[PDB]
Amino acid sequence: DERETWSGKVDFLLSVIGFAVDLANVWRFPYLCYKNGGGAFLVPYGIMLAVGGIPLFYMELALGQHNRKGAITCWGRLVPLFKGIGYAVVLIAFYVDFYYNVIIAWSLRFFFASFTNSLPWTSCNNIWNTPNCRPFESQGFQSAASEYFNRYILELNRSEGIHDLGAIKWDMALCLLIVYLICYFSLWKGISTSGKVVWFTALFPYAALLILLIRGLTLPGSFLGIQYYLTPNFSAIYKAEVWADAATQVFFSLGPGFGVLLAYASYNKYHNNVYKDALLTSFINSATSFIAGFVIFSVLGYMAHTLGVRIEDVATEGPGLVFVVYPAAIATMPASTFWALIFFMMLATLGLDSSFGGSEAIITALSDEFPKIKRNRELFVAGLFSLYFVVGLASCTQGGFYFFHLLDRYAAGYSILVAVFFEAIAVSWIYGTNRFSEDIRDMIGFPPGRYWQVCWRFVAPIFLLFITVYLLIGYEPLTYADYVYPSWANALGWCIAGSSVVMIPAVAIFKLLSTPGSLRQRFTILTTPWRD
C-alpha cells in the first residue's frame, strides 16, 4: 500500500507555494489594505493569520502527510461519519475548475494581444470604442482599456445577460484550449511532472514581482501610491467589518482545508517535518501578497499623480484591476510591450499552478478512492480536461463573463467555508486533538504545542463561523455593472453552492443507515478511525 513521493522536498514546497499564491494575492489584498485603513489592516490581518489561518493550514498539511491518502479517503478513514467532507471538497474543486481557468484564458488572450508595437488598449479610436470612451478612468465615462476588455476581449455588451450567451468567441476558446493543454500535459503523469512544472509556474511570479516592482517604484508618483497603500488609520480597525475582511482574506488566501494540501502532503515522506513547511509556505503566502501590494500601488500612485486619474477610480479589485486599470497604466510607460508581456505571463503563471492544485486534489482523491482510475490516470485526466473545455466553451461566449461571475460568486465561496468548518470539527472534537497530537508527534517527533491545540480546538471553528456569518450578513443578490441577474440565476447559484455541502449530511445519513446495530453503536462504529 506504499505510494510515490515528491522526488524532491523543494517540489513539495514550490507546489504548495504555487497553489497558495493566487491572483487573489495581487488583486484583493492590496485593495483590502487600501480600503481598510492601510498599514493598520496588518493588525487584523496578522492576528487572523496567526489565529485560525495558519492553524488550519498546518492542520490540513499534517492530515495529508499522516493519512497518506487524498481527501475522499483521508476523511473516510479519519472519521467515517464525516466521509462526505471528501466528496464535498472534490465537488467544490470540480466546480472551481469550470470558472477559474477562464481567468488564465483571459491572461493568455492579453498576452497574445501584447505582441504588437502599440498596445491596442492605448486609445479610443478603435472600431470597438464608443463615444463615451475616454483615455483613462473617469466618472460617467468608460476608460479605453475598459472599452477594450469589455467590448473586444469579452464582447460582453453584445450579450443581453446570462440568458443570452451569444456566439462562441473562438479566439478565446483557443486560449482556453491552450490552458487545458498545459494543465493536461503537466498533470497527466502526476507529481513526477507537476513537481517540475511548478519550478516555472511558482517561481516566475517572483521574477515578475521583482522586476515589475522595480519598474513600479521608479515611476514618478510611486511614493504617493505607497502612502495610499500603507498610511495607517487605526480608527478603522475598531470596526468589525475590517476583522471580517481580514478573516475571509486569510482563509481564502491560504486555502486551508481545501483538500489540495491533503493531496500534496500525502506524497511526503511520513517523517517529513510538515510543521516547518506549513510555517514557511504560509509566511511566503502573506509575504507575496504584501509585495504584490507594493507592485500594484506603486503604479496606481504613478497613475494618480501623472495621468490625473482620481485614485478612487483606479483602486479596485478583481479583473477590473488587472485587465483594465493596470494594463491601462502599462500602456503609457516606456517599453509598454515588455511590461505587458511579463505582466500577463505573471498572471498566467499565478493562475496555472493554483489550477494544478484543484486538479491534483481531484485526481488524487479519485485515484485513491477508485483504483480503476488510479491505474488509468492519463485517460482519466484527458476525459476530465475535455469535460472542462467543453463546458468552458460557455464561458468563452460573448456573454461568458456573466457565467464566469455567477460561478465565481456561488461555485465555492459559501460551500468551502462549511466544508472546512466540519473539517475542523471532525478533526478537533470527533477525532480528537489528543490523537491528532500523537499523530503529529509520531510524524515529526514533537507534539504541537498547546497554542496549536487551542487554535484547532476552539478558535478555528469560531474563526470559520465568523467568516461565514459575515459572508451571509453581507449577501446581496448578484449584480454586475447595472446588469442585475434574474432570480432564476441566483437560484441556480445557490443550487450549485448547496450541491457540495449537501454531500456532508447526505453521506453521513447514508453511512448511518448502512452500519448495523442501535443508534449509539452506529455512532461509535462510525467514529472509530480506520486505523484503530
Partner: antibody, heavy 118, light 108 residues
Framework: VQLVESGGGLVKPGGSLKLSCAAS????????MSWVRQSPEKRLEWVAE????????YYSDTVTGRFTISRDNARNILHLEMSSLRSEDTAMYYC????????????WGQGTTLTVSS | ENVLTQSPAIMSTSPGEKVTMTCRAS???????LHWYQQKSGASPKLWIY???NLASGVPARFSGSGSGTSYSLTISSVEAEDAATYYC?????????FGSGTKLEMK
C-alpha cells in the same frame, strides 16, 4: 517528577515476568514513555517505546514479539510484559520519559534488576 | 540498526585537562536527534546534551557538544573530579533507538 519501577528479581529461562513503572509529578497521559535496559557490562539498549496514548508502539529487533509494552493513563502506570525470557534479558531496566525526540530521555527511573537463571 | 560506536572506550584525565569524546554513526544522524547522557556509577543516566550542542537543564557550562552528520563530539573545557562518569551518545532519528557503547572518564 520521578519515576519508580517495580518487578524484577529471578525468573527461570523461558519464563515470563511483568515490569511496572509508576509515574508522578507530571501529566503522564501526554508523554511517550520508553523502556531502556542496561546489561551488566553497562551497555545501554533501548527495549520498547509507547506513544502518549499508546497507539504507536515500537520495539528493538532483539525483543520484538517476545515483550509487550503497555500503558495505563488512568493510574499513571507503565508496564512491560515479558515472555520467553532468555539469558540475554538479564539486565537492569530503566523507565525513560522520552517525550520529544529532539530532547531525548530527559527523565529516568531508578531501574530494577532482572536476572534470568536457574 | 544504526549502531553508534563511541571512542575512546575508556579515558582518564587530570582535573583541568581538556578532552573530547566522539560518537560515530554507521548511518547519518540528523543534527537535531543526537543526544548525550551521563551515568555515574550506581545511579540512573541523566540527559546531558539534547542535540549537537544544547546543554540540558542543570548541566554545567563547562560541557559543550559539537559536530554533525556521522561524527559527533562531546567536549569538556575543564574536567572536574565531580563528574568522572560514563557518557553515552544516542540517536533518536530512526528506530530502533541506539545508544553508543559508552565511554568513561577516570580521574588520575
Amino acid at each position: 517528577v520521578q519515576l519508580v519501577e517495580s518487578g524484577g528479581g529471578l525468573v527461570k529461562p523461558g519464563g515470563s515476568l511483568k515490569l511496572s513503572c509508576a509515574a508522578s509529578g507530571f501529566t503522564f497521559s501526554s508523554y511517550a514513555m520508553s523502556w531502556v535496559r542496561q546489561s551488566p557490562e553497562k551497555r545501554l539498549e533501548w527495549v520498547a517505546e509507547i506513544s502518549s496514548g499508546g497507539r504507536y508502539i515500537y520495539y528493538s529487533d532483539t525483543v520484538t514479539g517476545r515483550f509487550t509494552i503497555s500503558r495505563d493513563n488512568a493510574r499513571n502506570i507503565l508496564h512491560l510484559e515479558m515472555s520467553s525470557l532468555r539469558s540475554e534479558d538479564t539486565a537492569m531496566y530503566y523507565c525513560a520519559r522520552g517525550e520529544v525526540r529532539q530532547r531525548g530521555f530527559d527523565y529516568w527511573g531508578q531501574g530494577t534488576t532482572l536476572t534470568v537463571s536457574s | 540498526e544504526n549502531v553508534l560506536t563511541q571512542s575512546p572506550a575508556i579515558m582518564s584525565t587530570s582535573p583541568g585537562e581538556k578532552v573530547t569524546m566522539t560518537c560515530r554513526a554507521s548511518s547519518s544522524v540528523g543534527s537535531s536527534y543526537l543526544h548525550w547522557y551521563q551515568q555515574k556509577s550506581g545511579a540512573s543516566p541523566k540527559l546531558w546534551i539534547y542535540s549537537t550542542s544544547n546543554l540540558a537543564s542543570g548541566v554545567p557550562a563547562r560541557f559543550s557538544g559539537s559536530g554533525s552528520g556521522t561524527s559527533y563530539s562531546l567536549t569538556i573545557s575543564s574536567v572536574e573530579a565531580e563528574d568522572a562518569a560514563t557518557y553515552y551518545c544516542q540517536q533518536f532519528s530512526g528506530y530502533p533507538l541506539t545508544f553508543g557503547s559508552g565511554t568513561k572518564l577516570e580521574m588520575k
